[PDB]
């Protein structure tokens, strides 16, 4: 029925046409299927999904950056993503991601100052999440101490 309708339009029964490349002007070496597809623009526009963050506000207890573009959030560096750096060598990249990029409060400001100073040195510290963990375990009535060198 479709090929019969095509003949009524004086279009080819194959629904393939001779096409010419706009750039070269030469013909494509075999016929190409052309016609009309009804297309839809879905709600997922790059305009909305695009987000980026250098430094921003930080979470209340855990001191890590917030999540989500509406809260101007850092991307979550998950267990999965950590293991990838573990498989590689990348130990400094991992520490960065654990410490000056997330909790380490002193570390993040100090390293910001170094990067504007152009020093590109880390100077790591202690992630505030771990200090919380300690307090949470002592709140259970378990003595958890750091034993020195």
């Amino acid at each position: 029925e479709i090929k019969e309708l095509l003949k009524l339009g004086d279009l080819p029964t194959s629904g393939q046409i001779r096409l010419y490349d706009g750039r070269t002007g030469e013909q494509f070496e075999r016929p190409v299927t052309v016609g009309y597809m009804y297309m839809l623009k879905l709600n997922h526009l790059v305009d909305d999904k695009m987000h980026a963050r250098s430094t921003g506000s930080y979470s209340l207890v855990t001191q890590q950056p917030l999540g989500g573009k509406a809260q101007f959030g850092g991307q979550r560096f998950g267990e999965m993503e950590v293991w990838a750096l573990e498989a590689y060598g990348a130990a400094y990249t991992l520490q960065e991601m654990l410490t000056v990029k997330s909790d380490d409060v002193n570390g993040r400001t100090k390293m910001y100052k170094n990067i504007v100073d152009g020093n590109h040195q880390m100077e790591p510290g202690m992630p505030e999440s771990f200090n919380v963990l300690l307090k949470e375990i002592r709140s259970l009535g378990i003595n958890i101490e750091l034993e020195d060198e």
């Binding site: 950590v82 573990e86 990348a90 991992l94 520490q95 909790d103 380490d104 510290g125 202690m126 771990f130």
Partner: peptide, 17 residues
């Protein structure tokens, strides 16, 4: 171990570390 050092936010005992 590695998990232990990642938790305290230290250099991994492997690769660069």
């Amino acid at each position: 171990g590695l998990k232990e050092n990642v938790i305290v936010g230290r250099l991994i005992p492997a690769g660069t570390g």
